[PDB]
A paper describes a structure:
The parasite adhesin P. vivax Reticulocyte Binding Protein 2b (PvRBP2b) binds to Transferrin Receptor 1 (TfR1) and Transferrin (Tf) on the surface of reticulocytes, which is critical for red cell invasion. PvRBP2b interacts with TfR1 through its C-terminal domain (residues 461–633) with a buried surface area of ~1271 Å2, and with Tf through its N-terminal domain (residues 168–460) with a buried surface area of ~386 Å211. Here, we isolate and characterize anti-PvRBP2b human monoclonal antibodies from two individuals in Cambodia with natural P. vivax infection. To further elucidate how human mAbs recognized PvRBP2b, we structurally characterized several antibody Fab fragments in complex with PvRBP2b169–470. We were able to determine eight crystal structures of PvRBP2b169–470 with antibody Fabs with resolutions ranging from 2.45 to 3.45 Å—PvRBP2b-241242 (3.15 Å), PvRBP2b-258259 (3.05 Å), PvRBP2b-273264 (2.55 Å), PvRBP2b-253245 (3.45 Å), PvRBP2b-237235 (2.45 Å), PvRBP2b-243244 (3.35 Å), PvRBP2b-251249 (2.90 Å) and PvRBP2b-283284 (3.15 Å).
237235 and 243244 contacts PvRBP2b169–470 helices α2 and α7 and part of the N-terminal loop between residues D173–N174 and Q191–P194. 237235 and 243244 belong to the same clonal group and they bind similarly to their target epitopes with heavy and light-chain CDR loops adopting similar conformations when bound to PvRBP2b. When superimposed onto the PvRBP2b-TfR1–Tf complex, PvRBP2b-237235, and PvRBP2b-243244 show no overlap with TfR1–Tf binding, but they do bind directly opposite the Tf binding site. While these antibodies are not inhibitory in the FRET and IP assays, they inhibit PvRBP2b binding to reticulocytes by 47% and 43%, which suggests these antibodies may affect Tf binding from the opposite face of the Tf binding site. HDX-MS also reveals changes in PvRBP2b regions that do not directly form antibody interactions as shown in the crystal structures. In particular, 237235 and 243244 that interact with N-terminal loop regions D173–N174 and Q191–P194 also show HDX-MS changes in the loop between Y186 and Q191, a region that forms interactions with Tf. Based on our HDX-MS results, we propose that the binding of antibodies 237235, 243244, and 254255 results in allosteric changes in the PvRBP2b regions interacting with Tf.
Numbering used by the authors:
A (entry chain A): 168 to 309, 313 to 408, 411 to 462
B (entry chain C): 8 to 217
C (entry chain B): 7 to 141, 147 to 225
Write the structure that this text describes.
């Protein structure tokens, strides 16, 4: 019976110059998980374990600096949530002396103002991602037939770790929630033209406006996580003798796919609670709309 | 451990404030500090998350603010239900959190009173049993808790010192006690023993000796 | 939303105790969970943290390499196991929930369970007197080294009850409790009236009477 939105962490933004995803939940960067996976490789790769020193000094700095960067946007985040709470509750909307179509544009102005803060405060941090990746690519080189027992042992464990995520359960959740949302936007198009109840219908139209944004993010991760699952499984189905140059390309293959897997799984569980909370608002509003 | 006052005092309808200053990487770096209200037996509930915003159930009286490495909680229009222990919590970093020491917010129900301290030397019956224990009585003090420190001869002690929480007497004033266990050989070697009692900014101490 | 935790009362020193926090009323598998303990004297402190899956488990540096944390999403419980206990960590362990408003706050807390670390068996209290000291004067009756709680202390078999104060018990480093019962009396009439404290430790069938004179 929830009527207001407490959590608005479903907002994310990708940088335009270089394409990186910034989520409000830690670690904020999918690359940080890729950095966290190299510690498992370094412990099992060879006697060289110098990454344990860079993981505690350089990797945590990026994570800690990014968490601060997201924390600077509290003023933007609280002001965005304020516009979201107003346009959702008619009891909180009838207090102000402004119209819905008048302050519905103020929402978009602040919605993008907050997303700009998530990127600008992390723009200085994205440079360290390319600086750490080069450092990882530099420290790993220290032969024409390097071993591969560790590479394939990771793929065998990833497939078991992939089954921990309910992908088939998340996929069916979309097609039923998406069609139910399309049936909701269809009903208001025929009631708003025959029934004169503008104040309540505006909240249902606004809630559906944000629902499409979260469905987009919930879908966008589902295929990208699926693409990682489908590729990591493809590397297993498709040696024991590899050069050291391809070993850097081989570790980046499993590293980029698994870091995307864990980062997308972090967004999906968050966007799941966001979608259910949005549906509870539009479900209990139909009881008041009728 | 973040540092906040030991006790704060306010009258019904008055406004008080609480400082919270830990380290430079804890508070002033993240803007993720938070405050929690802890009743004696009940579970602690969240009053203010982030720097200045409040959950839905929190009244308008509680205010959140922060500057530099010092976070501050403000309670305006005090009511008798506001008497509790308040802790600040800042995000430490690398998936870790740090809590504050705590402040005993006490609504003023009566004029304040300073403690009466009596130190008891070890009982002769206890000395014959190869044991020794000092007792520092603290009674008739209001409001809130009290700080207790022990020193042997002229130097402070930091071993075997146990202290109780204040407790309401028959009257509304509180009472507490402090104990110091030591070997009977240590009781005869040291020149004296002391008990420092600091309440509401005023330190009172009493000493005994064999 | 309710967080119910269960913990043992007594634990021997250097032994392990498991603490379970049962969650309900909300989706336990989607929220993070935190542990918070509070010593009887000091305030509460952060202990550890788990993600919703259990893939990320972290703890404070003070209890690092000593406390193990895990969660069972199917059984909807939060698990904390502390090994090699020391008498300094006996605390009320609270079960904290990750906030709905954000991952940097705690929304719903647990009631907290008391965990005491004492390896000693049931022992009888030695009752030593506190001679009157000027202040009116104050004379006390010290009850020390008893296990377990509680002891009943009445003065003069209930004859006098004014000015009496029986404090709560403490947990010494040896795991035994101590307690002092103090009475405040006008100093002009202390040599004309004697005082006796009745200490009754029921678990040990111990009944002690102690005359208090300077």
């Amino acid at each position: 019976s929830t009527n207001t939105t407490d959590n608005i962490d479903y907002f994310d933004i990708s940088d335009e110059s270089n394409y990186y995803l910034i989520s409000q939940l830690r670690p904020h960067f999918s690359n940080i998980y890729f950095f966290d996976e190299f510690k498992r490789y370094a412990s099992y790769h060879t006697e060289i374990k110098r990454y344990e020193d860079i993981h505690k000094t350089k990797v945590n700095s990026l994570l800690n600096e990014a968490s601060r960067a997201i924390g600077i946007c509290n003023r933007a985040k609280n002001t965005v949530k304020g516009l979201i709470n107003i346009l959702e509750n008619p009891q909180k909307f009838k207090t102000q002396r402004e119209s819905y179509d008048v302050k519905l544009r103020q929402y978009e102005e602040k919605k993008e103002a907050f997303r700009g803060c998530l990127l600008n405060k992390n723009r200085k941090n994205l440079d360290q991602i390319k600086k750490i990746n080069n450092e990882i690519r530099d420290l790993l080189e220290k032969s024409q037939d390097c071993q591969t027992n560790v590479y394939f042992d990771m793929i065998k464990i990833y497939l078991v770790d992939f089954k921990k995520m309910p992908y088939e359960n998340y996929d069916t959740f979309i097609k039923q929630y998406k069609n139910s949302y399309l049936s909701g936007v269809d009903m208001i198009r025929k009631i708003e033209k025959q029934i004169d109840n503008p104040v309540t219908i505006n909240a249902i139209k606004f809630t559906q406006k944000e629902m499409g944004y979260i469905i987009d993010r919930f879908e966008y991760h589902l295929q990208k996580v699926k693409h990682s699952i489908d590729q990591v499984t493809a590397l297993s189905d498709g040696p024991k003798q590899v050069t050291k140059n391809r070993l850097k390309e081989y570790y980046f293959n499993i590293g980029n796919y698994y870091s995307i897997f864990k980062f997308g799984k972090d967004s999906l569980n968050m966007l799941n609670k966001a979608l259910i909370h949005k549906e509870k608002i539009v479900h209990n509003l139909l009881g008041e709309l009728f | 451990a973040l540092t906040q006052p030991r006790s704060v005092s306010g009258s019904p309808g008055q406004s008080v404030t609480i400082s919270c200053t830990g380290t430079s990487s804890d508070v002033g770096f993240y803007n993720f500090v938070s405050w929690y209200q802890h009743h004696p037996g009940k579970a602690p509930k969240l009053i203010i998350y982030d720097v200045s915003e409040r959950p839905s159930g929190v009244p308008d009286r509680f205010s959140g603010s922060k500057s530099g490495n010092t976070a501050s909680l403000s309670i305006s229009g005090l009511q008798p239900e506001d008497e509790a222990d308040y802790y600040c919590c800042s995000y430490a970093g690398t998936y870790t959190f740090v809590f504050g020491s705590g402040t005993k917010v006490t609504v003023l129900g009566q004029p304040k009173a300073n403690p009466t301290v009596t130190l008891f030397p070890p009982s002769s019956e206890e000395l014959q049993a190869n044991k020794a224990t000092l007792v520092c009585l603290i009674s008739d003090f209001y409001p809130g808790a009290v700080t207790v420190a022990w020193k042997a001869d002229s130097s402070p002690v930091k071993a075997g010192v146990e202290t109780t929480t204040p407790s309401k007497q028959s009257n509304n004033k509180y009472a507490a006690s402090s104990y110091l266990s030591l070997t009977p050989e240590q009781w005869k070697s040291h020149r004296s023993y002391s008990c420092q009692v600091t309440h509401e900014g005023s330190t009172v101490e009493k000493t005994v000796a064999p | 939303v309710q967080l119910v935790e269960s913990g043992g009362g007594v634990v021997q020193s250097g032994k392990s105790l498991r603490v379970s926090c049962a969650a309900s009323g909300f989706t336990f598998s989607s929220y993070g969970m935190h542990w918070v303990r509070q010593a009887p004297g000091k305030g509460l402190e952060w202990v550890a943290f788990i993600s919703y899956d259990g893939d990320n488990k972290y703890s404070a540096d003070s209890v690092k390499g000593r406390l193990t944390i895990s969660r069972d999403n199917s059984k909807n419980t939060l698990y904390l196991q502390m090994n090699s206990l020391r008498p300094e960590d006996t605390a009320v362990y609270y079960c904290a929930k990750e906030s709905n408003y954000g991952e940097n706050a705690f929304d719903i807390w647990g009631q907290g369970t008391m965990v005491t670390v004492s390896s000693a068996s049931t022992k009888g209290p030695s009752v030593f007197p506190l001679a009157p000291s000027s202040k009116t004067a104050a004379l006390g009756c010290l009850v020390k080294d008893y296990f377990p709680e509680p002891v009943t202390v009445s003065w003069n078999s209930g004859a006098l009850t004014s000015g009496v104060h029986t404090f709560p018990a403490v947990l010494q480093s040896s795991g035994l409790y101590s307690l002092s019962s103090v009475v405040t009396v006008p100093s002009s009439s202390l040599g004309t009236q004697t005082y006796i404290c009745n200490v009754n430790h029921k678990p040990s069938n111990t009944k002690v009477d102690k005359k208090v004179e300077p």
